[PDB]
Each structure stands twice: as structure tokens, then as C-alpha cells.
Write the C-alpha cells for this entry.
Amino acid sequence: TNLCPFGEVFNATKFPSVYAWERKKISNCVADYSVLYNSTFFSTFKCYGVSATKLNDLCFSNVYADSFVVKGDDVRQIAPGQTGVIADYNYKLPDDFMGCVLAWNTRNIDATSTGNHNYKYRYLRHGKLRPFERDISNVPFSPDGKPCTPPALNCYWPLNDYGFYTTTGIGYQPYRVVVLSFELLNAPATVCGPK
Amino acid sequence: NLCPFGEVFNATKFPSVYAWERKKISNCVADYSVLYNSTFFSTFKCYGVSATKLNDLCFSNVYADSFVVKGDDVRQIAPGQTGVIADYNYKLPDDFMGCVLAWNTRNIDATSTGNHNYKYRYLRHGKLRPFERDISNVPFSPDGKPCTPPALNCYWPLNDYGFYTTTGIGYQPYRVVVLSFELLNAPATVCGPK
Amino acid sequence: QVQLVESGGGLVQAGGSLRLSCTAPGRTLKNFALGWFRQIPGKEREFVAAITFNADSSYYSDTVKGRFTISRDNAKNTVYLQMNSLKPEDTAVYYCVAGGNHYDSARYFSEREWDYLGRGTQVTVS
Amino acid sequence: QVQLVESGGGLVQAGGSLRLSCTAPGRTLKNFALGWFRQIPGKEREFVAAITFNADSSYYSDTVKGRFTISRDNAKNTVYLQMNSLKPEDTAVYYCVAGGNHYDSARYFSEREWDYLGRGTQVTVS
Amino acid sequence: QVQLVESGGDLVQPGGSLKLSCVASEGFLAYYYVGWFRQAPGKEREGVACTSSSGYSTDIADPAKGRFSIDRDNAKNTVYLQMNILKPEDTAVYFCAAIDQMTAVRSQGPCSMTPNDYHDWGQGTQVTV
Amino acid sequence: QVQLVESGGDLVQPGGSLKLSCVASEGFLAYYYVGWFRQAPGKEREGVACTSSSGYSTDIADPAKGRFSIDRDNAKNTVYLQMNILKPEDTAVYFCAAIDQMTAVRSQGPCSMTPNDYHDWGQGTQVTVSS
Ligand SMILES: *[C@@]1(O)O[C@H](CO)[C@@H](O)[C@H](O)[C@H]1NC(C)=O
Ligand SMILES: CC(=O)N[C@@H]1[C@@H](O)[C@H](O)[C@@H](CO)O[C@H]1O
């Protein structure tokens, strides 16, 4: 009966880092997806296993929305089967992923002349992430695999920071990303189209 | 006696990158100055050694590997590289001591109707070890089970290059010679001149 | 990690026909939009055709409309480019691409909007 | 593959001095030539400095000659770029590169000449 | 698998109004495009109405336009067909049929309304005018 | 580890010629740059001659340029120093020294004539030339 709170995830004031991406479950509401594909600022609006223009005609068991911020050159890694430090150590999509990837430039927010370094990403890990797996740990990394503490050699903090400055090119400016997942279980449909 | 570098570099026929061929060089005097041509070798990278200092050095043995890749694939001949050529055909170790040489051979390896004799492997169950070689030609299946080619999900693991005289520099054929310099705590059998 | 590999290139006389194909090893392209790009000698890579994951929508460049037709068979994990009435201006290396089903026409050109790209196959017509 | 990670960025006052750093975490670079590149906003990436595997030779760009100093420590698997007397023209994202030690010194300008390129760190001179 | 059961069919007089109900037993109907069809003696089965999975896109056949309307209640697992100013030519047994939404969106336009499409069928209810 | 043993020292008269031999026991000398050094009484050790692993790059100190010559024979694990027009100023103990290649290549130039760089040394051989 209610409208699905898409404005609460797409226009939330703050966004999390990619290594600690956050998921919101959308359920028991009516989703008028034209609120999204009528917008003009979405720099990437691609879907997998479904067309966005036919989203208003469909019904799903649930809808999941993941939020995080990459830099421009890293948006390409939010795709099924992709490789790279974001797709392997931060946020990975399965190859049979059914949903949409949404991203828009946010340099007026999240980017400063001083330089916003608050957004982090993991660049060191023992093994790739599984699809939709999360790794929020911050333990010093060693290629050896044994415990080490930072000042020693061959010991590194596994989280690196983004450098969002208001003077860089769009490849280094920050982008807010929303990944929509459409679930189809053998259960009643709780998220449908407008009418 | 001079080291037979001429038998390697400006030779005649070169092998495919998947079936690269190695020549062991020993018991001779090596004059690397015959390679000191910048406009000939579009690639003349060395690792762990200096190219201008090769004539002043002595080594136990020298190894030369020969093969052909397209222009855009030459960058894959480097330590620790990833890609279909560096992972499935010719892999260099991270501690590689030696040099990598390449030069455009469109005039002798590319034809107007297209030369497709040069092949590369694009499917394999596992990456190659450094300096390993795989010359097998068994049909590939993602589940590892044997299969006859005409079936579904069964692929021939070798794919050929398309070398034409009409394409840009990225798709033109390049011949590559990788030189490895060995230090094996034995008598030095390949030294520079005088 | 997706590996796109083309097939079916070769030579044919002007006015003749030729069909290309492309697939991936084990990687299910059923949810991916698939398409074709073109690198004409002397010019940069340009768009040719694209087809959505379920073929509900296909797209062609104006230089190509009517003569080429793109199609797919998700059961075979393969996209095809049927090229008829080939002119000497079609001589190029053709590249296969896979990516998301963009709401807009970002599939048109903008090769970076596609996530993957094959290694190319040469087509020459005389 | 090889991950080149830059360290030591920030914002400096004009005429100060700041030192950069670059390391590959698990991959040894003792046999690799290492250097630095620069991307001023609005312009393409510029060469800065380059040092051989055993530091027998080092090369700098004409813009940063004398005030910039490249050095390496193979025991720490790290290359550094001491930047003294910085101008507002030094404001850029600085990239770290790794590649082979070329016979011809001119072959030190991106492309095939460098094998690996880091993600870059932003240095700005207020 | 989804099972369909039609109801509400009855005898009415010309100008009457009948509401037909298509309740899905077993599988949930919210994941299916639903269409309403009718068959009669001497008459090949023809499409009458169809709705998308959500009801966002609907269609009415030409002989039924302005008189027949389609609606659905996914919470109730039901699709309704509202028929007004019924004519004696509308006398037929009316079936409802479903097709998986992911298969239905492959086709352009609103739903389908074609007998070859929609392969899961109910057994129908009788409407006499 | 490589050991070096010099030989050939003797008494010469001015204008004469002598030939010293630096033979490497144990490790093979071909993988090493080799330098010739001398130490006069009451004086610091001074570099006389200089060669690379293959003998492709050599050097001779200024007081010996035009008189002394260096050569090697990696098949016999030996480096030679040919002295000519011997003057009383050449009276000294003559040393040969080896530095491993790649380490020697780190420095630019043909090779090193600096005692502090070589680290490995032989026992020396005395060369006396009369008045
Ligand atoms: C090449 O084989 O032939 C030429 C004849 O000597 C010469 O210019 C060139 O350097 C030769 N290359 C080599 C490696 O010997
Ligand atoms: C997803 C969403 O609600 N977007 C809203 C949209 O309704 C409108 O364009 C405007 C209203 O304030 O602000 C956007 O953020």
C-alpha cells in the first residue's frame, strides 16, 4: 500500500565506504521505478537480466539496495564477473546477477578543495570475496599470512583512502553507487509496480 | 667463436607463442652490441641487468626463447604480467634476470589475404608456471571432463592470430626474443668480447 | 574475467554475405547485453550493433542499418552478426562486447560503457 | 597482478618540500625500473622521473630538474620522489610506474615503455 | 506450478454486468502476466483482456473495448474481468491464463492477449447472455 | 668464497718489464671485476689497473697509463698485469682485488680503481726496481 522508500537510499545525506557497503531491504510496498529513470543525473543506469523500462510491469519477492562511493574510474568494476581491487576485495556481483547498477557524480558533496579522504577501500586481502560478501575487518596485512604489526616491514594496513578533490578530472571525482537486486523466491510478492 | 645470436634474431621461421622454442647458448663469445639498435627493436627492456653493460659481463649460460605475438600482446611479455599470453603461453617470473626484445615483422609475417598460422592458447585449467610450456591440443571443457569438439560447452583451446597488411600497429605481427642470463656457480662459458 | 572470443571472420567479395559469432567459456551471458564494434583501418573503433539480454530491443548504426542483423541464442551462449550486401567500406576487424542493459542508448558507441571486449576478428571484402 | 600503491600525498605550501613513496606489497621490484608520472588537471599525463633497478642511471623531466630527486631502496622495495621548491604548477595526481630498464633512455614515456601504473596520489601546492 | 480456477460466470440478460474472478491455487499469481480468453461454439478461442504482472500495462480486445475492463489483486492471488453492457454475442466460456513475467516481457507492447502464448490455463466458467 | 693469490714479484732494473699473475683459487674469477693495487712504503694503497668481467672495459691509473696493461684469461681463472719501463717509483707490494659483477656494475665507468670498493683481497707480491 505504501510507496517504496527509494528517496531514503538515493538521497540519503551520507553514504558508506565500498569496503563496508550497506544493504537496505525493500519490502511490502509499491515501487514506481519511474522515480529513478526519469532522473537526469544518473551517469550509469544499466540493468542485468531485466530491462529498466519494464520494471513498473514486474513484481518481485523483495528488493535489495546496496550503497557505497567509488571514484569515477572504479564504477566500471561494479559489474558481474569484473576484476580489479574493488570487485575482488570490496564489492562483487555474481555472474547471474539480476538487477541494476546506478551511479551519479557527486563532487559538490563528498569532494573538497582541501580533499575529502574519509572514503576508504580495501586493497589487500587473502583471497577474493564471494558474491555479496562483506569484509569490514581492519587487521594489519602481511603477504606471509602471519600476524604482524604496522611498523615492521612486509606489514601493511589493508585499507586505502580515496582522494576526492574539487580540482581533479571526473575519473577521480567521487560517485555514489546504488545496486538494486530483485529477488524471486517461492513466496508472496511484496514489491510490485505502481498500478 | 662468436655466439650464434644471428641464428636466433634475424633468422627465418619463428614459432607460435604457445609452442615457443628455446636455444641454449654456451661456450662462445657474446657481442651484444649487434643488438644495440633502437629503431630496429621497438622493445629492448632488460630486468636485473643493464643493456649497455652486457658486454662487460660473464654468465654460465644464456638462453634465448623465440615466438610471435601481435602488437598489443607484446606488453604481456614482462615479469608478473596477467593476460591470455602471459598466463597461458609464456610466463616470466618476478625475479627474471634478462632482456626482452621485439620488432615488427609485418613485412614477413603478414600477408594481404591474412596469415593465420600463428596460434595462441586462450583456455587452460590453471595458469602456467614461469617458463613452463604447454603444446597440448586437447578439447577444453569448463568442467574438465573430456569432450568431442562439435559438442556444446566444448572448445578448442588454440586460437590463431589474424596478421594482415592493412591493420594498424596493434594487430601487426611482432617477433620476440627473450634472453635469460644464468649464473649457476659453474665455469663461465658465455662472456663478452676481449 | 569474462573472455569474449569471436568466430567466423574471413574474406568475401562485395555484395556477398558473412556471419560472425561470439561467446564466453562457461560465463553465462544470458543477463548481459551483447553487441559488436568495428575498427576500420586508419579510423578508431566505432559502434555496429547491440542486442538486449532477452532480445526485446536491438540497435544498429546508420552506416549499417538494414544490411546487418544482430541476434542471440541464450541456449548456446552466443551472439551473431549476420552481414549481407557487404561493401569495401566494411573491411575491418570486428570486436565483440558484453555489458549491462543501459536504460539509455549508452550502448551506442561509448565502448567504455560495455564491461568486456573480445580480441577481434578480421573481415575483408573486395 | 602487480599493484603499485603510492603513499605520502597531501597539500603543501609553495616552496616547501614533500616526499612521495611507492611500493608493491607482495611483489618484488628489485629488477624493475621505477619512476613517477604526473597528471595536471586538464592536461595529459606527464613524465617526471625514472630510476633503474640498481640506480646506475636516473632521468628527470625538464620541468622538475634539480628540485625533484628520485631514489630507491630495494631492501624496502620502495621508490621515493623528493619534491622541493614546489610551484602551483606541481598540483596534480602523481602516478607510480614500474617497467623494464630500457636500452634507449627515451623509451621512458608510458605506453609499452612502462609495464605497471599505480592508482595515483594527489599532491597540491596551495 | 500455478493452478488457475475461474468463477463468477452466470446467466445474465442483455445489458447486464458480470464480474469474473481468476484465483490462482498453489503458485502465486503475482509473478505471471494474466490474460482473459473466451471460447464459444462455432467460435475459435479469442483474446479478451490481458494485464501485466503488476497491472501497470493492460489491454482490451476490439470487440470488448469500452465494455470490458481488467484488474487484479496480487495480495488476493486474483485477476478480475469486469464486463458491462453484455451482448448475446458475448455468450461464451471464459478462461484465464498465466505466463511467467520474465517470458512475457520478452514481447513488446502491453501483455499479449494471444492464445498461443499463455500456456497455463484454467478450465473456464460459463457466461450466458 | 673466491681467494686470490698474486705472483710474479721480483727484482728488476730501470726500464725492465714484469708480469704479475692474479690466480683465483676456489670460486671462479670470471664473475668478478678485478683491480690491481700497489702500496709503496710509507704510502697509502693506490689503484694501478682495472678490468671488467670479460675484459671489455679496462682502466689504467694515470701514473701507469702508457706503460702498464691489464688482461685476463677466464679459462685459467687469472688476471694479468703487464708492467713496462719500470721506474723506481713503481717499487711497492702489488695486490689484486675482486668485486662481484652486478655489484661492480652499480657504479658507472669502465671499472673501479678505488681500494675501498673491492673488499676481497690477496696477500700481495713485492716488486722492487733498482736505481
Ligand atoms: C643480421 O642477421 O644480419 C646482418 C648481417 O651481419 C647484420 O646487420 C645484423 O646485425 C644481423 N643480426 C644479428 C643478430 O646478427
Ligand atoms: C529517488 C527520489 O526520491 N528522488 C527525488 C525526486 O523525487 C525529485 O527529483 C526530488 C524531490 O525532492 O529529489 C529527488 O532526490
Observations:
- The longest helix of chain F spans residues 115-118.
